[PDB]
Design a protein around this ligand. Structure first.
Ligand SMILES: CCCCCCCCNCc1ccc(CNC(=O)c2csc3nc[nH]c(=O)c23)cc1
Ligand SMILES: CCCCCCCCNCc1ccc(CNC(=O)c2csc3nc[nH]c(=O)c23)cc1
Lengths: 208, 208
């Protein structure tokens, strides 16, 4: 898998060179490239942002600079991912589906986002996905791209989860559930499913 | 605000020293400390993980090492945050509420998570929150803590969003909507609300 990430903050993708992602990249499974969006600008001040049409707060990322960067990095086979608070929610099924892709391109935005015509122009030649990592507001899309790449890379390398325990059996007056010390595989699996259904009902009832 | 993050991978929190978070930290608003969990171990091999009771895949983070680290860093006023796939979903309202906290402690887990008795023992003296950033699986909680800190720090420093546009008015045969060039504040706001309702219905109908 070839992964390209375009951003005004390349240093923010540095966690992808460590731990699980780092291993996958070093072992030739993944070819990861981080690019500074300013390398495609032609002006003296390397500007990437301009004032929005119709007024509004902040700045908007210019379509011609994104258009040059994507023209160079993308092909007809590329899946262009645009992290955005207005996208569809990223899920485990999306992470699983993206392991089947040959080339993923993450266009990380800052300011108030990227001019909408970049994605419309990209959609004429390649598949585009506008994706949110959740119902909260981030300063940019770099940390969302890290999250998305980590979910995809761990699937390449290889109800809510219930509680887990390890030694000691008693710690600060707190005992490991007696069932986990039974040796009985069947009642262990039954208890884990039971506490997993219970935690799901309390914390995420939408999942049952 | 004082923020402490405990992890076996301190380098994975390096994006918090750049951009928006970096500014907030440097300007004395936020006091950020990253700690290596191995600094509280006493064994020769600095082990943080052990085999799970009741069998299962992988390893579980030991309660005594987490117990020592939290005993030193936390007080009765501390809000202990445990990033976990089994937690409640992180939202904008949570990010807003956490700006009111004096001391936030993020206990980042690796392997299959942290022994459950750590949070039960912590809940005897401090407020604890078990939080997920979304319905996808990550290799650990460092990138989820980055996401959570970035959402909180941007609120300190200061329906789905509709499309945005900037110069030029025509780019690759794609024109900026005529309404955004009208000068008419009222029909601009009406059009933006309209395209925002439309995008919400298509991509996130659960929000209306
Ligand atoms: C005083 C300055 C003006 C501030 C006005 C802020 C109003 C909100 N503008 C919308 C906006 C918010 C955040 C972003 C950056 N977010 C991401 O790139 C992002 C990418 S994926 C994602 N997932 C969840 N939430 C997210 O914010 C994101 C882009 C546009
Ligand atoms: C062959 C090795 C065995 C693999 C078995 C994996 C089965 C799943 N175990 C549960 C588990 C998954 C991920 C984690 C690490 N995740 C986070 O720390 C995390 C912290 S916040 C969060 N939000 C969404 N998703 C997340 O995964 C997280 C911890 C326990």
């Amino acid at each position: 898998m070839r992964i390209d990430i375009v951003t005004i903050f390349p240093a923010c993708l540095d966690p992808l060179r460590q731990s699980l992602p780092g291993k996958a990249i070093e072992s030739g499974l993944v070819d990861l490239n981080v690019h500074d969006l300013r390398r495609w600008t032609h002006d003296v001040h390397h500007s990437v942002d301009d004032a929005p049409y119709g007024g509004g707060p902040g700045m908007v990322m210019k379509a011609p600079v994104w258009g040059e960067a994507l023209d160079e990095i993308c092909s007809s086979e590329t899946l262009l991912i645009v992290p955005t608070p207005a996208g569809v929610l990223f899920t485990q099924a999306t992470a699983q589906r993206w392991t089947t892709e040959s080339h993923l391109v993450f266009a990380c935005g800052r300011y108030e986002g990227i001019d909408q015509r970049v994605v419309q122009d990209a959609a004429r030649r390649m598949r585009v996905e506008e994706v949110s990592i959740g119902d909260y507001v981030l300063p940019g899309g770099e940390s969302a791209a890290v999250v998305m790449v980590e979910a995809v890379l761990r699937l390449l390398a290889g109800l809510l989860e219930g509680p887990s325990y390890t030694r000691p059996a008693s710690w600060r007056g707190l005992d490991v559930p007696e069932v986990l010390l039974s040796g009985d595989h069947a009642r262990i699996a039954a208890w884990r499913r039971e506490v997993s259904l219970q935690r799901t009902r309390e914390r995420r009832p939408d999942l049952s």
